Every structure is written in structure tokens, then in C-alpha cells.
Amino acid sequence: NYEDIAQEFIDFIYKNPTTYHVVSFFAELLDKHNFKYLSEKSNWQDSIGEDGGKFYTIRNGTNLSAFILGKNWRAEKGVGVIGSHVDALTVKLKPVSFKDTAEGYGRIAVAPYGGTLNELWLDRDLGIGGRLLYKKKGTNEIKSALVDSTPLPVCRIPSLHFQTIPVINEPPTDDEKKSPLFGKHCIHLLRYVAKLAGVEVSELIQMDLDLFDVQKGTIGGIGKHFLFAPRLDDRLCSFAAMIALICYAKDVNTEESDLFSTVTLYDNEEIGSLTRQGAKGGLLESVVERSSSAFTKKPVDLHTVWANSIILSADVNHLYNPNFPEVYLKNHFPVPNVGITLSLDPNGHMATDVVGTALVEELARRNGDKVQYFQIGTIGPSLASQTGARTIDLGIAQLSMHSIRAATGSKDVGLGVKFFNGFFKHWRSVYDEFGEL
Amino acid sequence: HNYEDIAQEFIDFIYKNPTTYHVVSFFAELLDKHNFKYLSEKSNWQDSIGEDGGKFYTIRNGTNLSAFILGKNWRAEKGVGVIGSHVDALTVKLKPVSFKDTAEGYGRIAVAPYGGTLNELWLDRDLGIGGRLLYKKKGTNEIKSALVDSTPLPVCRIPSLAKEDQTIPVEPPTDDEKKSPLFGKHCIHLLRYVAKLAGVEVSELIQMDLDLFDVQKGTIGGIGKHFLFAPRLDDRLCSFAAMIALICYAKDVNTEESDLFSTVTLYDNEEIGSLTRQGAKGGLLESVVERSSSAFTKKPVDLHTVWANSIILSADVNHLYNPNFPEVYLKNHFPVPNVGITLSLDPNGHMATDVVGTALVEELARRNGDKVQYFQIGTIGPSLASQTGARTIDLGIAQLSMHSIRAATGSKDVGLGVKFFNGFFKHWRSVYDEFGEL
């Protein structure tokens, strides 16, 4: 059902404001569906057998790779990849967020992540949330907790007839003063997040906190054709790709299968992808190399793996704005509630690659999907040249990406899930038709 | 004390009453369940108001409301205690012909800004549709009014690009539907939709005055819950505070033991300069007072003496100190949240050269335990002051980001506003007596 899945998506965005939450939500979901967690810091020889299986691993709490490795898989089968990003534009709390009292008001020093933060972030109810690092008293292990003020908006960037943030008891306790963070954040804030995590202010080691729009998404429009929500870029494609993987994995037994499938979710795409958790940090390549090495003791030719692989770089494109027709190109703009959109740039990486377009075109035909085009995304070029594998830039189109609240079709989440599910099922048999090309 | 929310009651009020029509209708229901009697402005009031006086309210246009308490023992020399405020807010309005043909399958509507050339603040906000429909049921010759509201459904939005640019993303016509007077003017789907909400047929729709407004419900906000975020605060915040103050005050008033004449009058079209018949310059306040005093006693009433003895609080919002822009504000002349009512002073403007009104408000607050704040930099105060000859004081509850689609103010400010206004109705006459001839 398209209505139900759109509501699931709204819920997901509402309940998982920060990248940390998103990766933790998918971690939980994968666990429920019998994917086995693999620590990056351990060797995978002893975790992965000839049987293959369903696994996932996490880097930095923000970079997730989930994969299904078939028992009968071999290098010439390649890998079926969906790559996407889970970072969104936000305001981040500065390492020292402490602000002097300004005529009675309390404020916090913050910085924009992923851009300059425009006028659309003014007068929005902003919650606070993210990752605390803490060390319980009498121990020497540092741990992670996620906190989230929702539904409480702790602050707002006020607009001004004529970019810091108004947040606002008891003086600081001797215990509280022992905290590493005691100098660097106002004591009220430290108490608030300490309270949310269920730990003492003295035990707080560090913070990575976002300010985010706390307004829940809605189905909208007079015929309910639209969906308005925060953080659509690109948790929309990430969500749809992951649900597609889990639905696909439902009807898969790794002992029968000869396929290698993965959905890898990256951080730092809004920052240009050149970090360890970004597309350029190699988690995908690492997963496939590690897995293939642990899987069999026959040495695997990775060049043959990637030469037979298809990577879908799933990043959102621009839905047609009927009020700025001049911006768009006739016959190369998508509309809502039709299907996935193919990104085509004459000066981008697919400019001299007609095979990927045709493959996707062929997939949609078999699966009963429609494909739209867009002609005037770091992940695609990065992955394509890092692996040597054929890569297609795809996406679910949305209105006003990099708004604090974007819009897309109410059916587009479901249509995205359908298409990506179709990809995992048919890509190999479709790619076979092109042979050596 | 624990009852300074009241902020929730206010939040629910803004949420449930998005247009001026809804706000006036809401106050009408509140007043008459507090035993205020509705008087038609289209009928003479001689036989509706008697020696005993009473509690009354009248309405002009469904957007301009006056509520008053007239004492049995009132006389010209007592004057009137007036709070004047406005209930119109900045919105987008559906144009008289809102019809746009499809843009690549997208449905759209022609709309116009009301009260400004609207902000980027209106972009990417969930917008409901609502307001007044006029209709005539079949085989009738009465034109009736229905109120309509899509909340919580946002039927549209003005998209940013990642009346040309600011436009809006939103089976065949029945013979009966083509018989509607609005058939060519608005797309059949919208007409079918509003007809459904009102509980009437499309063919019965005569006219409509619909707004587009933010359907995001207000919230208490801040880490210590010091703030209130909500749409349409200007000037539904003062209007609410003044009306609730009057109704709380009215509770302890038997009109038979009263010598006071009290009113809260709520105007339309302040954002447009007030020069309409529903605005401050349309004179509903003066009309109410002349009519009441005429109907109430057989003796002739000198209205000049009434106004010379009156005090009008012209209640409209001031600007909270925005700590992000210290330079626009004047030191020792800017309000902070959760403290109290703010007095608008302006060296040019109608309250320059009138130190008495300022002194009176200070004395009131002193007596009632309130705090007063200052703010030096077609407003209704100057209009009302000059129209009546009565001493008028500009003040209000201060807020941030005024004329934004979502503004901010103290979480205690609704309650403090009600407190101050309640004190005003109780004490103004007594306090103004010691200024004597001044």
C-alpha cells in the first residue's frame, strides 16, 4: 500500500532526526530481518562462510553498508549496488557552543552543515539531538548515546519593519565542574542532554548535536498527491533503497542464490564526499573486498567483480516547478507520482555511457515501472571511477531540495521502493543481455 | 500561577480559528455563553437596551466585533474604558477568479498577498484553505454564510526553487454544477471541496472569501519553555488577551450595580491602513457608544463629555528585543519576554506631547502589581484618538519576527496581557480621576 508506506516514511523522518538516528534505525530494522552485524574493527574471515549470508556494518555511526552474499556467488556475477547518502543539511552545535548572555537571552553558537543556511531556516521550530559520548563513573570505557528533544523545540533562528539562536536556575555543582565539556557549553544545555541520555553531566565526554525542524511531515494537497517533510535529501532514496533490500531479502535464501547485493549509505555528501565516511572513503569497496576474501579461499579477481557490476547512485533530482519554467529543459524534467528519475548531465560521468540508461530503461519495462529524465551529485562519479563499475545516477525527484521542508509525490516513496526492489531481482538477468558492452 | 497556560488555550484558539471570520465567530460564541446579548447593527437598539444597561456585542461584516458592558448608573462624566485591537492578519487570499489552467499537469490557483508584499518566510510552509462561503440553498431567496476550514489538511504550498514566482501547487462538471455563479471562476475540484466542507451543493455557492494560512499548530518552546511559537500573533494575541480580560471582568459585574461603560472593539483591515468600514476609521466603537447612550436613557447624552472622560487602550504589538540585531533597538527602550505589557512611545506620532496617558498606565500597573515596558522606535490609536477626542495610549504585548508567518513571544505573555487588561477594566476610572482636569 502506497498510503501506508508514505506514513512509515513520515514517521521515520520524524523519529530519526539526525544521521546517527537514521543509521541506528536501519541497524535495528536489519537486525529484525535477520541481517548479522559485522564490526569493521574485526577480521571477517570467521564471521563469513561459504554459506554467505545477510550482513551489515557501520562506520562512524553514520556510514552503513548492508549486503546479501549468495553461497553460489562468483566474480563474474558482480555486485548489484544502490549507493545513497543519509546526511542532510543542518545547523550543528559548535564544539564550544557557549554564548554570553545577550540582554537576558540565552543563545548558542552554531554552524551550518552542507551549505550556507538560507532564509527558509528562519522562524522554524528547531529541536536538538544527536550523539553524546560519555564515560560512566568508575569505568574507562567511553560509550555512545543518542538524544532527541522532539517534540520540544529548544530554539529558533529569528527573522527580523526596520543568525544566532535564542534557547532561553541553579549554579554549577562541584561534580558538574569535573566534566570535560563544562567549559564549552552552557550548563543548562549540559543538564538537559545529560537528562535525556540518563547520565550525569560529569560523565559527558563529547557531543555531536544538530538543530533540526521538529515539524512532522504530512500528506498534502487537495487530492493528497503531495508529501511535505524535512530532510528529504536524501533520506527519501536511502529509505526506499533499504526497504527495497529488506523486501527483496524476504524471498531470498543465500544457499540457493548466486547474487551479491548491497545498499551502502554514506555521510558527508553535502560536504563533497571526501571523508572516511563519505563515498570516497571506500566502505563499499571494502565490504566487497573483505567479503569476497572471507567467503572463499579461491583468490577472487576484484577487477572482474566490478567489471560485471551495476551501481545505482541514488540521489534526488529536481521535480518540475511550474512557477519557474525557465529553469527547466523541455522533455527533461520529472513530475510527481510517476516513477524514478534518471539524471543525465552532458558534462557528467554518464555523458559518454548509453548502456546504463538502456539497462534502467530495460529494467523498468520488465518490472512495470516508468522512468523519467532530468537534464540541466558526488557519489556517482566517485564510485564509478573508484570501482571501474558502470554507474547510473538515479533518484526520486523532489521540489525545493535544500529547503528545510521539501515536497515530493505522496506515491513516490512507494514507487521508489517498487523500482529498487525490481532492480535487485532483475539487474543481473538484464545486464546479461548487453554482454561485453 | 500554574494557570499562566492559558497559553495552550491561546494556541488552540489560533489553531482552530485561522481566518478573521473564525476569530469573530469564536468570540461571539464565548461572549454569548457569558450572557452577552447580540445586537444587530441593522436594527435600532432603543428597545433592546434599557435602564438596567447590560452586556452586549455587535458585529460588522463578520470581521469587526464590539463587545460592551453598560452600567445602569453610567453617565457621560464617567466616560468609556476602551480596548481597541485588530483581528486581521497577514495572509494569502484566493483571488476572485482563482482559476489557472494546468502547468504540465500541476493544478494551481491565482492568489494575492493581504497586508504586505509577502516574504520568503511564506515559502515551503503547509497551507490550509479556509474562510467564508456565501450560499443560497435551492428554492430559497436567503443568502447565508458558512465557515470552512481544511485544517489539518494542507491543500497547498508556495514552493521555493532549489504573482509570477509566488504561485501554488494544489471528474467532469455536472449540469447542476455549471448552474453555479462561481463555475467559471474557480476550478471545479476546489469548488467541490469547499462545498463538501460547508455541507452544501456546488450549485448553491454564491461567493467566497478564502485565505491560505499556515496549518502548523503553535507550540510552547525553548529549553526552559520560555517561548510560544505560533502563526498570526499580530494582532490576535492582544485581541485574545483583551477579550478574555473583559470576560473575566464581566464575571464579577452585575450591570445594575455599575456606573461604568466598558468595551473591547476588534477591527479588520489594520494591515491595510484601517480606512475601511470594518477598520478603525469605520467608527464601530463610536457607533456603539452613541447608540448605547441614546437607547439607554431618555435624557440627552453629551458625547464630547463622554470622550473627554474616556481612556482608549489602542492595543497593538511591539517588537521584542532580537538579540541577533542589537543596533536597530534603542537602549533602555526595548521590551523583553515574560515581563509585561509594552508601551509604544514614538517621538513623532500621536503620543508625543501626551505624558498623562503614560503616567496613567504606570499608575494602573503599580496598583495591580503589573510591570510595564517601554519601546521607542494606519495605526488605530491615532485614528481613534482623533475620531473621539479621547485620550489614547498605544501599547501591547511584544513579539519577535512580527509579520512572519510564524512569530514568537513569551510563554507567560498571554497571561500577563490578560492580567494587565483585567486590571485596566477594574481600575482605570479610579486612577484617571486623580489626574482631574488634566
Added chain:
Amino acid sequence: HNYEDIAQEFIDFIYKNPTTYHVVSFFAELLDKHNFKYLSEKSNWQDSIGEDGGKFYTIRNGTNLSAFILGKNWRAEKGVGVIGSHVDALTVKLKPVSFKDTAEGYGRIAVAPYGGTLNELWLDRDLGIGGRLLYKKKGTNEIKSALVDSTPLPVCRIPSLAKEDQTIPVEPPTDDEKKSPLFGKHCIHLLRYVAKLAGVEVSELIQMDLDLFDVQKGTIGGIGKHFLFAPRLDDRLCSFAAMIALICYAKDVNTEESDLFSTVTLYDNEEIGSLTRQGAKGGLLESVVERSSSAFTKKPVDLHTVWANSIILSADVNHLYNPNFPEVYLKNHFPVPNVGITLSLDPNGHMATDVVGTALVEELARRNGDKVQYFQIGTIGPSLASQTGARTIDLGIAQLSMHSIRAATGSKDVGLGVKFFNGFFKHWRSVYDEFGEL
């Protein structure tokens, strides 16, 4: 039907009555030959208006005229049916001292634009001189008024080059002529010329208020004769239509069998912002109504109830679709010629938030077989609405090139205007009754 000219009658009217003085005087003659009785505004009307009511008109300044029909059975609850319009037009005026010494033999006069900073459209047009002279005949102590008009003689023109640039290319003084109060102020030739037209001596001239205006007679135009080209259409077009409508309506009215109060009031100084005693804000309409209702019955009349039940058509011209400039116009909100009256709607402005007036005009047209057009983008409507408290609708007959020295409109538009306005006087009361409390 063949009698939609009427356009000729209008053309002859503009041609023969170039100044505001002439227009008011022309209407005075038309009214009193239709048995309307002149009332001096300087005398009390108690003994001039009786139980029977009647047909009347009064004049302020020779430029502000009100004509009214008061029914024998009229009462406050019936209200007034009002059409309000303006009769001043853009012109050049002779300055109080118009005297210029010769420029290489050329005779010239100091003049000022009235109602604008005037166009290149005024260049190379034949300009007559005319207006009001004040004079005192010899051995008298009465100051009388004479109207003066040079048509068809163009006495001057503002030349283009193939108050510095816009100036105008136009024997010894008798002892008696030097005795005139205007001797130093205007050149002897001009004074001799206007004195001749009035039939008085130069020595008898006290003062003058003279215009310069286009003497080119209007024409029906277009290959199918769809248009009317003429000077001074704004707003002598609506004024003419409204007055003729009233007089046609008055024909079938015995005031003894009437319960209606009807008026067409014509104002001066709309081009100047209306804040003069002869303008809309000078309150002639309200004065007429208060006086009439006072004189007419011994019972006291509640004026608030009168206005609450009234409808004012504020008749002023809108803009025809100029096919040369499509971008300035808003789609589905622009009038075309020869269709019918145009409703002025404006999202900001006094008719925003009043859907009832629009609905009433639509219902009227429906009943009378008229068509209504829309136009969304010191006007008198807002002034009158706020001054009375009465529901006011802005509308009018649309034209091209408004504030040009020669404008255009439909050749059928005078007749359609008269038709609509005649229907209004016949049906407004009945149609407004079904809105009831609204």
C-alpha cells in the same frame, strides 16, 4: 436598441461642458426640468422638505452636487441607495497671476497642472479656455458668478520642440480697466476676452477660476464603430451614466408611493486626493442624508441604522485591456469594451474581506440582465465606506488611456452604464434584503 446612442448625447455633453462648473450647471438644468427642487445648503431645510418627501438637489462650491429622491414612506431600516462619483478631471489651470511678459513678441500665460504632473499627451493639442468668473456689476454689492467658454476657439497650446518647458503660446488699458481687482494679475487682452464672453466689463471682474482643456469634440470610432474617443472621460463618464440613470428612474417614481431614499452625489477634487470640503471627505452625501431625515419627519432618525442598511456604489473608472501591454494586466481579471460594468477588486484596499458587496452586484446584474466584469490590479469608496459605515462597492465603466487628454471606451458603454445604474436604483433594496444580517 438603436438608442445606445446616447453616446452622441454623451459626446455633446463633454463638448458643451468643459469645466466642472459647466458639468454641475448642466446637471442642475437637467434635474430641475425633471422637477427636482434646488435646496440651498446655506439655508435650513425643515420647511422645504415635508411628509411627502420629494425630489431635490443641492450644490456646494458649484463643483459638488447631490441629487436625491426621498420617499414619503422612507424609514431608517430602508437605508439609502447611493451612487458616488467625481466630476473633476485632469486639466491645466490658469495661475492666480497668469501674467507673463512677452518672449520675442509671443504672448504667454502662467499655468499649473491640476491632478497630475502632466503628460507629453498634452503637447500639440488645441486648448480652449473656460470656467468661472466672479464679478460685481457697477453700483452693486453682490458678487455673482458667470460661466465662460471659448469653444470652439483654441486660444492656446503647449508646443513640443521639434513650468519651464510646459508653457503656452496665446490696446492700452482704460482708466476703468485699471480699476479692476485683476488688473495687474492677468494680461489686459485675456481679461478683455473673458469679460466679453461673460457680458460684463473688465472693471467688474473680481476673480476667476479658468481651465485650459482640449476643444476637440469626441467621436464614435473604429471600423465597426465599437469605440468612443473623447476628452475628460475620468470620471465624467460614470457621473453622466449615474445621473441619467437616476433621472430615468425618477420618471416612474411618485415620491408619495415610495419608501426608498436614493441619491447620486458628484464630488470635486478626486484627482487631488479628496480631502477638500467639495471632495468625498467633505461629507456632502452624509450632510444631505442627515438634513433630509431631520427635516422630513418629527420622529428622531437613527443614522447608524440608516447606513448599516445602505449600499454605496463608488463609481470610478477601471482599465480596459490594452492589447499592446498584456503583461500589466492580470489574466481573468481585465475588462473588455461593450460588455458591461467593471467591478474593481484589490487584494489590499477597502473591498478585500467584503465578499457580500460583490455578491450583491452580481445578483443585481443577474436580475436586470446586465453583465459584470472583474478587474484585480484618495479614492472615494474607502472614504465614503469609513465615513458612513455603509457597505460600499467600487466599480465603474472601464476605459483605455485613462488620464490621457483623450481617452477611449466602448461605444455601447455609456448605455450599458446607464442600464446597470438604472437597475441598481430599481432593485438594490430588494436584493440586499436576502443577505439579511450579513
